[PDB]
Amino acid sequence: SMILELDCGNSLIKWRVIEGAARSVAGGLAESDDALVEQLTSQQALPVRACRLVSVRSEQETSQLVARLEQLFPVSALVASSGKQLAGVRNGYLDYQRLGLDRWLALVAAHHLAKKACLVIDLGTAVTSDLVAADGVHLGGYICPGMTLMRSQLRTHTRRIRYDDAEARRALASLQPGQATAEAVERGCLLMLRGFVREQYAMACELLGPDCEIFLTGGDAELVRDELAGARIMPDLVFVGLALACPIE
Amino acid sequence: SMILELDCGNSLIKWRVIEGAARSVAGGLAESDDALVEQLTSQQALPVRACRLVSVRSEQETSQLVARLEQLFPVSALVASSGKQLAGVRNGYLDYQRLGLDRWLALVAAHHLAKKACLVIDLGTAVTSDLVAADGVHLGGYICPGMTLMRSQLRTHTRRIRYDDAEARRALASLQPGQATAEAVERGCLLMLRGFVREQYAMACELLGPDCEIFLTGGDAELVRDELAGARIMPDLVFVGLALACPIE
Ligand SMILES: CC(C)(CO)[C@@H](O)C(=O)NCCC(=O)O
Numbered sequence: 001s002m003i004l005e006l007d008c009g010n011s012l013i014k015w016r017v018i019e020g021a022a023r024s025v026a027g028g029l030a031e032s033d034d035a036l037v038e039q040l041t042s043q044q045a046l047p048v049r050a051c052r053l054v055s056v057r058s059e060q061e062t063s064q065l066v067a068r069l070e071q072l073f074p075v076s077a078l079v080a081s082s083g084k085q086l087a088g089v090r091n092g093y094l095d096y097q098r099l100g101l102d103r104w105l106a107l108v109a110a111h112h113l114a115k116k117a118c119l120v121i122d123l124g125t126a127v128t129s130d131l132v133a134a135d136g137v138h139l140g141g142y143i144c145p146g147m148t149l150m151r152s153q154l155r156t157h158t159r160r161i162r163y164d165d166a167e168a169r170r171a172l173a174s175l176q177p178g179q180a181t182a183e184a185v186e187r188g189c190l191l192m193l194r195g196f197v198r199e200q201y202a203m204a205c206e207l208l209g210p211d212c213e214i215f216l217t218g219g220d221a222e223l224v225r226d227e228l229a230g231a232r233i234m235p236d237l238v239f240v241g242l243a244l245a246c247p248i249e
Numbered sequence: 250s251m252i253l254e255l256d257c258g259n260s261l262i263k264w265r266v267i268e269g270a271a272r273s274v275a276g277g278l279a280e281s282d283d284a285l286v287e288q289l290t291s292q293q294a295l296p297v298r299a300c301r302l303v304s305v306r307s308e309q310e311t312s313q314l315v316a317r318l319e320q321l322f323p324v325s326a327l328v329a330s331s332g333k334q335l336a337g338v339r340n341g342y343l344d345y346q347r348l349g350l351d352r353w354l355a356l357v358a359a360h361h362l363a364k365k366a367c368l369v370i371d372l373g374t375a376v377t378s379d380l381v382a383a384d385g386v387h388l389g390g391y392i393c394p395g396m397t398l399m400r401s402q403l404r405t406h407t408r409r410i411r412y413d414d415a416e417a418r419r420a421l422a423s424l425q426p427g428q429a430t431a432e433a434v435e436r437g438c439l440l441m442l443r444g445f446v447r448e449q450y451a452m453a454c455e456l457l458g459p460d461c462e463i464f465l466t467g468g469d470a471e472l473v474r475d476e477l478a479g480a481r482i483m484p485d486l487v488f489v490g491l492a493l494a495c496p497i498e
């Protein structure tokens with residue numbers, strides 16, 4: 001029997017099916033629930049018998065998804081929930097229930113793996129960064145927009161900024177001053193992202209020491225990884241935390 | 250005989266009335282044409298006999314605004330336009346007509362004043378940065394969201410991000426890790442802004458030399474000026490450029 005795992009975001013839903021402890025045998029990114037069902041439909045031949053997920057969407061939307069999943073596979077989905085502590089890590093928010101569960105599971109997984117102080121940055125649709133002391137105490141974190149959100153707002157929600165995906169991709173071949181809109185926007189936003197990452201490293205050095213472990217996750221982690229040569233890039237970091245939050249078998 | 254000057258952005262319209270060559274005697278920030286007309290007719294009437302403006306809004310929106318102004322004041326409004334060259338400065342965009350006029354006028358004004366290599370950063374609704382070589386050749390630039398745009402896109406991204414201005418203002422009293430949503434977002438976004446500024450300073454040092462002049466403008470220049478002690482903060486930089494683009498009397 002295999003396990004279906006999901007990371008439900010506001011814009012995207014990341015899923016994977018694992019064999020054994022954590023061997024992924026299938027997965028993908030869905031921009032919509034219908035797209036998800038379609039994706040899970042083509043891989044409906046896999047012997048899925050368990051399910052766990054983390055979500056930052058409304059409780060109602062998460063329930064609709066859970067019910068939807070329990071209709072595609074013979075499972076009783078486990079859903080991660082807020083907590084003051086998990087796996088030796090203490091939630092650092094004044095109101096523990098306010099901390100995004102995606103941030104929570106990622107930072108818990110990070111400390112669980114490092115057993116040292118660490119900086120955890122998720123470069124996704126939105127960007128999040130959290131710091132955890134060596135003793136497992138979450139210091140708190142930050143939230144800011146990611147490339148996807150910045151591009152969308154400037155490209156459609158402003159009046160004179162227009163360019164397609166092809167020129168958007170070619171624009172990141174250099175970070176020098178742009179001589180066309182796509183270049184100015186893509187490079188500007190990436191420099192903003194890279195600058196934020198450096199600010200985070202500086203903050204981590206001051207509060208955690210220059211010996212802290214650095215964890216990067218999210219689809220845009222590759223865009224900033226050269227900035228921190230020793231950083232651990234872990235695409236499935238949140239799923240590691242999901243396993244700790246929702247143990248199975 | 251005074252001059253009414255305006256800078257029409259995508260979210261706000263900044264205006265000022267000047268006496269003589271450039272002495273500002275009145276001004277404000279309007280969120281709409283109506284709010285502008287309100288601001289222009291609420292204070293004691295001034296002898297406005299000329300008007301010039303720069304706009305990055307659509308031509309129809311601009312013509313619409315001009316119609317209002319020409320009815321409110323006995324003037325024939327001058328509207329800035331794209332150019333390959335102005336006041337000894339050469340446009341660096343491959344298609345000169347695609348460069349935002351606000352960016353163009355600000356960078357031209359900067360070089361006009363310095364007659365040296367310049368880094369020009371506007372920290373406003375949106376953030377723009379342009380570099381100009383000592384010989385007046387615009388190298389190109391960048392575009393990113395400003396504090397208001399970052400907050401806005403995050404607000405639109407998730408209903409989980411909602412808080413008062415009071416809470417928002419209190420949150421910026423420190424850049425340490427946030428322990429509440431307001432702190433995480435405001436501090437995260439500010440660190441992204443501050444990080445972008447440092448990336449810009451590094452790019453300028455590399456391409457223009459360590460001795461380049463730095464100009465900061467925009468309402469949020471206050472949030473980052475501590476990073477560049479020797480920077481020249483000029484709130485009305487774009488208007489210096491407007492005077493060059495649209496000379497009067
Ligand atoms: C910020 C997001 C949307 C990023 O996925 C998520 O972590 C979230 O909904 N957080 C709740 C607000 C907070 O973490 O302060």
Ligand SMILES: CC(C)(CO)[C@@H](O)C(=O)NCCC(=O)O
Pocket residue numbers: 158159160161180181182184258259305347348349350351352375377392
């Ligand atoms: C980036 C803005 C919106 C800032 O006001 C403006 O400069 C603009 O509409 N520029 C056009 C696109 C460009 O400058 O590449």
